């Protein structure tokens, strides 16, 4: 009872496959017009999620 | 080149009307005619 406790719910890095697929069970968000918005728009691959 | 649709390998969806063009990282796919990405 005092050892086994592991939901294993840990998003590991950007490269996690959960982020890549735009599943509706989770919603991702950021801050408008910030630097991260520029970072994603500039990338020629990340405009899929 | 002739092609078909299978979800994990090739995905065909209609283009965005506001953009009026195929989205990036995609190719036009004429049917056999409405352009789809």
Curated annotation (Swiss-Prot), chain A:
Subcellular localization, as worded in the UniProt entry: Cell membrane; Postsynaptic cell membrane; Postsynaptic density membrane; Synaptic cell membrane
Superkingdom as given in the UniProt entry: Eukaryota
Record PTM: NMDA is probably regulated by C-terminal phosphorylation of an isoform of GRIN1 by PKC. Its phosphorylated state is influenced by the formation of the NMDAR-PPP2CB complex and the NMDAR channel activity.
Binding site for glycine: 35
Chain positions carrying an annotated carbohydrate: 21
Record note on quaternary structure: Heterotetramer; the NMDAR subunits are modular and harbor tiered domains that function in concert to regulate opening and closing of the cation-selective ion channel pore. Forms heterotetrameric channels composed of two GluN1/zeta subunits (GRIN1), and two identical GluN2/epsilon subunits (GRIN2A, GRIN2B, GRIN2C or GRIN2D) or GluN3 subunits (GRIN3A or GRIN3B) (in vitro). Can also form heterotetrameric channels that contain at least two GluN1 subunits and at least two different GluN2 subunits (or a combination of one GluN2 and one GluN3 subunits) (in vitro).
Function: Component of N-methyl-D-aspartate (NMDA) receptors (NMDARs) that function as heterotetrameric, ligand-gated cation channels with high calcium permeability and voltage-dependent block by Mg(2+). NMDARs participate in synaptic plasticity for learning and memory formation by contributing to the long-term potentiation (LTP). Channel activation requires binding of the neurotransmitter L-glutamate to the GluN2 subunit, glycine or D-serine binding to the GluN1 subunit, plus membrane depolarization to eliminate channel inhibition by Mg(2+).
Pathological condition linked to this protein in its record: Neurodevelopmental disorder with or without hyperkinetic movements and seizures, autosomal dominant: An autosomal dominant neurodevelopmental disorder characterized by severe intellectual disability and developmental delay, absent speech, muscular hypotonia, dyskinesia, and hyperkinetic movements. Cortical blindness, cerebral atrophy, and seizures are present in some patients. Neurodevelopmental disorder with or without hyperkinetic movements and seizures, autosomal recessive: An autosomal recessive neurodevelopmental disorder characterized by severe intellectual disability and psychomotor developmental delay, involuntary and stereotypic movements, spasticity, and inability to walk without support. Intractable seizures manifest in some patients.
Similarity-based family: Belongs to the glutamate-gated ion channel (TC 1.A.10.1) family. NR1/GRIN1 subfamily.
Name of this protein: Glutamate receptor ionotropic, NMDA 1
Organism field: Homo sapiens
Entire protein: shown range: 654 to 702 of 938
Swiss-Prot record, chain B:
Disulfide bridge map: 22-37
Domain of life where this protein originates: Eukaryota
UniProt-annotated location(s): Cell membrane; Postsynaptic cell membrane
Described function: Component of N-methyl-D-aspartate (NMDA) receptors (NMDARs) that function as heterotetrameric, ligand-gated cation channels with high calcium permeability and voltage-dependent block by Mg(2+). Participates in synaptic plasticity for learning and memory formation. Channel activation requires binding of the neurotransmitter L-glutamate to the GluN2 subunit, glycine or D-serine binding to the GluN1 subunit, plus membrane depolarization to eliminate channel inhibition by Mg(2+). NMDARs mediate simultaneously the potasium efflux and the influx of calcium and sodium.
Subunit-level organization: Heterotetramer. Forms heterotetrameric channels composed of two GluN1/zeta subunits (GRIN1), and two identical GluN2/epsilon subunits (GRIN2A, GRIN2B, GRIN2C or GRIN2D) or GluN3 subunits (GRIN3A or GRIN3B) (in vitro). In vivo, the subunit composition may depend on the expression levels of the different subunits. Interacts with PDZ domains of PATJ and DLG4.
Family named by the database record: Belongs to the glutamate-gated ion channel (TC 1.A.10.1) family. NR2D/GRIN2D subfamily.
Record remark: domains: A hydrophobic region that gives rise to the prediction of a transmembrane span does not cross the membrane, but is part of a discontinuously helical region that dips into the membrane and is probably part of the pore and of the selectivity filter.
Implicated disorder: Developmental and epileptic encephalopathy 46: A form of epileptic encephalopathy, a heterogeneous group of severe early-onset epilepsies characterized by refractory seizures, neurodevelopmental impairment, and poor prognosis. Development is normal prior to seizure onset, after which cognitive and motor delays become apparent.
Protein name per its UniProtKB record: Glutamate receptor ionotropic, NMDA 2D
């Amino acid at each position: 009872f005092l050892v086994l406790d592991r939901p294993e719910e840990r998003i590991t890095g950007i490269n996690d496959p959960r982020l890549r697929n735009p599943s509706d069970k989770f919603i991702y968000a950021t801050v408008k017009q910030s630097s991260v918005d520029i970072y994603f728009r500039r990338q020629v691959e990340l405009s899929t999620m | 080149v002739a092609t078909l649709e299978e979800r994990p390998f090739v995905i065909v969806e209609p283009a965005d009307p506001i953009s009026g063009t195929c989205i990036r990282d995609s190719v036009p796919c004429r049917s056999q005619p409405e352009k789809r990405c």
